[PDB]
Design an enzyme around this catalytic site. Structure first.
Site, mmCIF file in Angstrom:
data_model
loop_
_atom_site.group_PDB
_atom_site.id
_atom_site.type_symbol
_atom_site.label_atom_id
_atom_site.label_comp_id
_atom_site.label_asym_id
_atom_site.label_seq_id
_atom_site.Cartn_x
_atom_site.Cartn_y
_atom_site.Cartn_z
ATOM 1 N N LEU E 41 38.052 41.392 38.372
ATOM 2 C CA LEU E 41 38.337 42.108 39.467
ATOM 3 C C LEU E 41 39.961 41.915 39.841
ATOM 4 O O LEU E 41 41.071 41.300 39.197
ATOM 5 C CB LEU E 41 37.318 41.830 40.637
ATOM 6 C CG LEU E 41 35.843 41.956 40.219
ATOM 7 C CD1 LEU E 41 35.312 41.345 41.171
ATOM 8 C CD2 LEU E 41 35.522 43.310 39.896
ATOM 9 N N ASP E 42 40.209 42.886 40.648
ATOM 10 C CA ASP E 42 41.671 43.032 41.311
ATOM 11 C C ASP E 42 41.523 42.567 42.979
ATOM 12 O O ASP E 42 40.495 42.097 43.256
ATOM 13 C CB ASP E 42 42.067 44.384 41.208
ATOM 14 C CG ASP E 42 42.476 44.746 39.765
ATOM 15 O OD1 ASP E 42 42.305 43.901 38.903
ATOM 16 O OD2 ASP E 42 43.192 45.798 39.638
ATOM 17 N N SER E 43 42.797 42.782 43.325
ATOM 18 C CA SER E 43 42.940 42.216 44.622
ATOM 19 C C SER E 43 42.175 43.125 45.672
ATOM 20 O O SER E 43 41.420 42.459 46.423
ATOM 21 C CB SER E 43 44.521 42.352 45.145
ATOM 22 O OG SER E 43 44.873 43.791 45.448
ATOM 23 N N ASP E 45 39.538 44.759 44.953
ATOM 24 C CA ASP E 45 38.207 44.531 44.731
ATOM 25 C C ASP E 45 37.687 43.086 45.373
ATOM 26 O O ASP E 45 36.578 43.100 46.002
ATOM 27 C CB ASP E 45 37.947 44.248 43.135
ATOM 28 C CG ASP E 45 38.437 45.350 42.190
ATOM 29 O OD1 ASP E 45 38.541 46.177 42.777
ATOM 30 O OD2 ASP E 45 38.889 45.086 41.195
#
Ligand SMILES: CCCCCCCCCCCCCCCCCC(=O)OC[C@H](COP(=O)([O-])OCC[N+](C)(C)C)OC(=O)CCCCCCCCCCCCCCCCC
Ligand SMILES: [Fe+3]
Ligand SMILES: [Zn+2]
Lengths: 258, 210, 48, 30, 85, 244, 122, 231
Positions: E41-43, E45
């Site tokens: 995932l990402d920041s 997310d």
């Protein structure tokens, strides 16, 4: 008026009677008692036709005794009971430095003059007998420095340390123990703490001088204010419609507050 | 160049004030307690009943609170101080509990002396140090900051080191010593009237001047 | 010798006499005082 | 230079002396 | 009676909340899984995961504490140790 | 709950006024054995439950309240006998209880400086404030009914009025309650004198206004057994003058 | 064998009523009530004597179930105090008195919760 | 005793007289008795144990001599010194010096044992921050700077304890020896040059004390008094 004059005369008679009774009691003591007299203790003393030269911003405690050839620079502090008598030689205390309470900065011979640099702390009860302490040093509480000792810039002598004759404390170094062994390196955070301590104690000296340089009237007025503002009621204050704000006289400067 | 102040007091016609209130902080002394006239209690100093603050010492609780407990003895020329925060993260106020005898040249800063303690002269207690209950430190002992003296023990040396454990008979004598210096302090206390007669001297000086 | 401890002391002095004496009396009075204190529940309705 | 300048304190002292004299007279006449 | 949520209930609720994301998959989710690496995932997310967790548990998470919720285990410990959950 | 001066005033002042009112409305006006029976039941309940509840209390103000309830129960035995000696005993008990309550609440206000709340707070008081510890222990023993102090005078004269009363049940219940309710006073005395707590609550000194009153009340309580004739005669005269 | 104090230091955390996270430092052998008082989130005058008799549940702290297994269980006196001194006469099953919580390295790192403060003056 | 009873009666009479004086001052409107002034006395006495100080002997105003001190001729006691002899006497000979911020005191109470009176001989330097506690020091000795000396310590003639040395109970420092260290131990023997230095230092320091006393005996400054009084 005439009533005031009559009451003053009655008070004078009562005062004379009370003094007579006090003298009778003192006589009945048997002569053992030592009557309390005036102070007789002088903070700044001139000796050998050679006067102390202290700045206008230095805080010298009334209990502190400076005698003779002490020359203290700007923003310095000499705390309660500290003794600095340069009579056989000279004492030169720089700017931004502090010599804490119950300490002693004496000088000897006539040559090992005592030199203390700038932004340097000489802790509680520390004894100096002709040292040369450079700028931004740190002498701990109870440390005793003998003749001819030299402490370099940013050097620490720990608490309760005997430093002997002609010993040199190198820069960025800590010396501790009765024969003053090398201990540590006095890292950057410690040096920053030293500087911050010097600044904070300068501010504390300013606060102490401001409080200690007050006459009888100021002392009485601030005592009355402190007694009246010691404790507060909010219910009755809210009922009356008042706030009872703390006066600026009792507001301690933020420089010395956490 | 330094500029001397012409209006600087070289003679105050009165020594150092025994009580120095800083801001709203007024030093408190119990009526039963005895503080010598030569002492200087500045700032947040609290001396409780039975304390025996001896001549020549100084207690400067301007940075943080200083507390002297019941029957506690602080002897001649000692220094007591405090500071914000300590190396141990514990509260850094100088606390001295009941039945604690403290020698002549003791240098106390941010200590937490538990009750019934004996501390010799030339003893130094740096910031964060605590001497636990029923413990003895002999003369000349210096404790590094953050060092603790365990309960029921005797310690010594320029670096604080454990010497030997304390027997019960030796432990029970700490309150006896505390109350003995308390009795000597009571003997010293009777020589002082509630109000000094120096004001007569200052009035005589004023009359002599005019 | 057995009567000195098994009967006179443990069974009577530290036994029946004390159980029916200070010990049991103390326990019963403690519990009764606690129960009485439970009545003061701090409720205006209870007081009324 | 030799007069008490507090009117309220002077009145209080007068009242106190009057009280002492009245109490003494009451005791003597009782 | 009762001031803290049960540890098992908190773990199950946090796992279920994480399962309700389109990007994540039930196969790669574990009680000890880093949001950025394990779940891919990402920041944003992670921020949305923290907000969904706090919305489910009904109490606001401080900024630094939310920044320290980079793992399911950390989230479970924080939720189980908070009295407002 | 009420502030300590308020509760002291509530415990001291209304008792005498309400009891004089009760004497003037019941003993004079509606004097009849049913009223004394009602007050007999009330006194039994008052003594028994006051002792039982004060044994379980751990707060100074609540313990004082329950002691007041018990002493009101004793005043109620004095009423429920309802004779000349009964009314004289009622008045003696009221006077002694008022003096003892003034003493106790003066000491409490003296300890209010450091905000005393629990019984344990006054622990180790025999070291910090010795004379205060002895004074408060004397007050507690007076509340108990130990002979040399003032409380015992009201106590035994109430019991004597109850023995001449014919109320053997009432006297037995009262004396059993007196034995039972000694425990919490003894616990207070233990807390001052016997215990050695880990930490001590140092109490600030008194004001002269409380100190003079406390000294006078303690001297009256301790030295009342040397000369009780004035109070006894005054109460006897009051009881006689209730009717004629 | 230097016998410092950092070994006796026990570091734990406390969330007070309004939810603010706090760091609490207390010595081993000194109670959680003393540690919280030193931290400053409990009124020192509210609770002075560290005794069960002098405790009126002003030292009550809610502790997590996974931390209740590391300290001795509640005594009868503690349970009685919690039951009596409460808004409703029930046991919270997660709260223990701060007087009887003896801090130690086993409890080091424990997270506690400080409920809404109660009045104590008269 | 009768002497102590008369002392107490005199205290009562003095207190009553001072109260009458303050009543008269309040009647006059003079509230300057409320001005808190330092009550420190350079010489403080017990009931019947007033300190003795010979004339031509320097005693600093900051120095406090409590009890049974017995200072002799031509000697010096400097600023910040505390000299306590209430439990047992302090005998101080002629020509000796008690330098700044020093302490010579006798043991409090008899818990440790018998209270040893403090004895300090002639022509002896007694250190610059020393804390002497009921010990005996002989003539022409040099107690060092910030030195601790416990009860029972006997320093012999012409013997040196160096600065910072802590001499423990029942320790004897013999003739012509230097002792130092926290567990005070012998370091090196002395030399006749060092003994002559000790004597010359004692003499010139007594001369400096005479100069200090002469400078300090000057009348108090009316200018300073007015400066403090007015603002
Ligand atoms: C006499 C009554 C009175 O108040 O006199 C004023 C004077 C001076 O009052 P004053 O107002 O100057 O000072 C108030 C503070 N006292 C009273 C404590 C000094 O009061 C007294 O003399 C009262 C004490 C002696 C009473 C006999
Ligand atoms: Fe508690
Ligand atoms: Zn020197």
């Amino acid at each position: 008026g005439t009533l005031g004059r009559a009451i003053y005369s009655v008070g004078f008679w009562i005062r004379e009677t009370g003094q007579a009774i006090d003298r009778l009691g003192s006589r009945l003591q048997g002569g053992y008692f030592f009557q309390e007299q005036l102070s007789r203790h002088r903070t700044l003393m001139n000796i050998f036709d050679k006067a102390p030269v202290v700045d206008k911003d230095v805080f010298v405690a009334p209990s502190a005794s400076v005698i003779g050839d002490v020359q203290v620079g700007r923003g310095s502090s000499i705390w309660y009971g500290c003794v600095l008598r340069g009579d056989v030689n000279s004492i030169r205390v720089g700017s931004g430095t502090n010599i804490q309470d119950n300490s002693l900065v004496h000088v000897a011979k006539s040559v090992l003059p005592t030199v203390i640099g700038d932004n340097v702390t000489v802790g509680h009860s520390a004894v100096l007998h002709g040292c040369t302490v450079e700028d931004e040093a740190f002498v701990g509480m109870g440390a005793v420095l003998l003749d001819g000792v030299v402490v370099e810039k940013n050097a620490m002598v720990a608490a309760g340390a005997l430093v002997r004759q002609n010993t040199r404390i190198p820069s960025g170094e800590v010396w501790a123990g009765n024969p003053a062994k090398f201990l540590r390196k006095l890292s950057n955070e410690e040096i920053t703490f030293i500087s911050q301590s010097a600044i904070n104690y300068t501010n504390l000296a300013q606060v102490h001088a401001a409080e200690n340089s007050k006459s009888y009237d100021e002392i009485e007025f601030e005592k009355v204010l402190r007694k009246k503002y010691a404790r507060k009621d909010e219910e009755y204050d809210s009922m009356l419609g008042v706030v009872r704000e703390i006066p600026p006289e009792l507001i301690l400067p933020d420089n010395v507050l956490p | 160049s330094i500029t001397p102040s012409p209006d600087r007091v070289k003679w105050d016609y009165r020594g150092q004030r025994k009580i120095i209130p800083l801001g709203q902080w007024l030093p408190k002394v119990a009526v039963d307690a005895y503080v010598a006239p030569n002492v200087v209690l500045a700032g947040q100093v609290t001396v409780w009943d039975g304390a025996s603050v001896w001549p020549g010492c100084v207690l400067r609780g301007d940075l943080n609170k200083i507390s002297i407990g019941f029957c506690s003895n602080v002897q001649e020329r000692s220094v007591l101080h405090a500071a914000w925060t300590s190396p141990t993260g514990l509260p850094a106020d100088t606390s001295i509990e009941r039945y604690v005898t403290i020698g002549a040249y003791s240098l106390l800063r941010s200590c937490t002396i538990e009750p019934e303690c004996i501390i010799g002269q030339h003893s130094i207690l740096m910031e964060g140090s605590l001497v636990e209950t029923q413990s003895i430190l002999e003369a000349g002992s210096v404790v590094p900051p953050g060092r603790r003296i365990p309960s029921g023990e005797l310690w010594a040396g320029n670096p604080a080191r454990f010497v030997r454990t304390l027997t019960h008979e030796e432990i029970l004598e700490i309150p006896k010593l505390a109350v003995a210096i308390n009795d000597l302090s009571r003997d010293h206390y009777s020589e002082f009237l509630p109000y000094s007669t120096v004001y007569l001297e200052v009035e005589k000086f004023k009359k002599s001047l005019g | 010798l057995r009567f000195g401890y098994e009967v006179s002391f443990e069974a009577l002095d530290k036994g029946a006499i004390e159980i029916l004496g200070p010990y049991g009396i103390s326990y019963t009075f403690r519990r009764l005082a606690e129960r009485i204190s439970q009545l003061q529940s701090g409720f205006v309705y209870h007081y009324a | 230079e030799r007069v008490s300048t507090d009117k309220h304190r002077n009145y209080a002292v007068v009242a106190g002396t009057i009280t002492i004299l009245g109490a003494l007279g009451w005791y003597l006449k009782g | 009676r009762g001031s803290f949520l049960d540890k098992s209930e908190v773990a199950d609720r946090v796992i279920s909340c994480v399962k309700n994301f389109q990007k994540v998959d039930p196969a790669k989710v574990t009680p000890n899984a880093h949001f950025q690496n394990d779940l891919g995932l990402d920041s944003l997310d992670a921020v949305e995961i923290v907000m969904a967790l706090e919305e489910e548990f009904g109490f606001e998470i401080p900024d630094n504490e939310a920044d320290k919720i980079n793992s399911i285990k950390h989230a479970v410990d924080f939720i189980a140790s908070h009295p407002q959950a | 709950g009420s502030p300590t001066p308020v509760t002291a005033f509530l415990s001291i002042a209304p008792k005498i006024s309400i009891f004089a009112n009760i004497l003037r409305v019941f003993i004079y006006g509606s004097y009849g054995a049913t009223l004394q029976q009602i007050f007999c039941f009330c006194s039994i309940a008052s003594m028994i439950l006051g002792a039982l509840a004060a044994m379980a209390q751990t707060k100074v103000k609540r313990l004082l309240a329950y002691s007041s309830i018990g002493h009101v129960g004793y005043i109620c035995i004095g009423f429920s006998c309802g004779t000349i000696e009964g009314i004289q005993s009622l008045l003696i008990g009221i006077f002694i209880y008022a003096l003892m309550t003034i003493d106790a609440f003066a000491i409490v206000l003296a300890l209010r400086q450091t905000r005393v709340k629990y019984i344990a707070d006054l622990g180790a008081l025999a070291k910090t404030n010795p004379i205060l510890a002895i004074t408060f222990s004397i007050t507690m023993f007076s509340y108990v009914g130990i002979p040399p102090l003032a409380g015992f005078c009201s106590k035994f004269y109430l019991f004597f009025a109850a023995l001449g009363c014919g109320a053997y049940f009432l006297a037995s219940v009262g004396v059993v309650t007196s034995v039972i309710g000694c425990f919490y006073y003894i616990r207070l005395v233990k807390r001052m004198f016997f215990d050695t707590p880990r930490t001590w609550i140092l109490y600030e000194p008194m004001d002269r206004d409380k100190s003079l009153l406390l000294a006078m009340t303690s001297s009256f309580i301790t030295l009342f057994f040397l000369y009780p004739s004035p109070l006894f005669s005054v109460t006897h005269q009051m009881a006689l003058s209730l009717y004629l | 064998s230097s016998k410092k104090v950092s070994d006796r230091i026990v570091r734990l955390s406390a969330i007070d009523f309004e939810g603010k996270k706090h760091e609490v430092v207390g010595l081993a052998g000194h109670t959680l009530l003393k540690a919280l008082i030193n931290t400053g989130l409990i009124d020192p005058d509210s609770h002075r004597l560290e005794e069960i008799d002098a405790c009126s549940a002003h030292c009550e702290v809610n502790i997590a179930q996974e931390w209740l297994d590391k300290l001795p269980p509640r005594s009868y006196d503690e349970e009685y105090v919690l039951v009596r001194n409460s808004r409703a006469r029930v046991l919270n099953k997660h709260s223990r008195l701060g007087c009887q919580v003896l801090l130690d390295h086993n409890l080091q790192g424990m997270v506690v919760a400080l409920p809404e403060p109660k009045p104590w003056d008269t | 005793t009768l002497g102590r009873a008369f002392y107490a009666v005199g205290f009562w009479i003095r207190e009553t007289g001072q109260a009458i004086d303050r009543l008269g001052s309040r009647l006059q409107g003079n509230y300057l008795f409320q001005e808190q002034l330092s009550r420190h006395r350079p010489l403080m006495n017990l009931f019947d144990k007033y300190p003795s100080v010979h004339k031509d002997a320097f005693v600093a105003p900051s120095a406090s001599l409590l009890g049974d001190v017995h200072v002799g001729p031509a000697s010096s006691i400097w600023y910040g010194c505390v000299l306590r002899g209430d439990v047992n006497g302090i005998v101080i000979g002629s020509g000796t010096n008690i330098q700044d911020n020093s302490l010579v005191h006798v043991a409090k109470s008899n818990l440790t044992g018998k209270v040893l009176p403090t004895i300090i001989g002639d022509n002896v330097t007694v250190g610059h921050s020393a804390v002497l506690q009921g010990c005996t020091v002989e003539d022409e000795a040099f107690i060092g700077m910030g030195a601790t000396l416990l009860d029972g310590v006997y320093v012999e003639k012409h013997a040196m304890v160096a600065a910072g040395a802590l001499v423990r109970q029942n320790t004897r420092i013999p003739y012509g020896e230097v002792w130092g260290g926290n567990p005070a131990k012998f370091l090196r023997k002395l030399t006749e040059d060092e003994m002559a230095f000790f004597s010359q230092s004692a003499l010139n320091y007594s001369n400096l004390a005479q100069a200090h006393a002469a400078e300090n005996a000057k009348e108090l400054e009316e200018t300073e008094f007015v400066k403090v009084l007015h603002k």
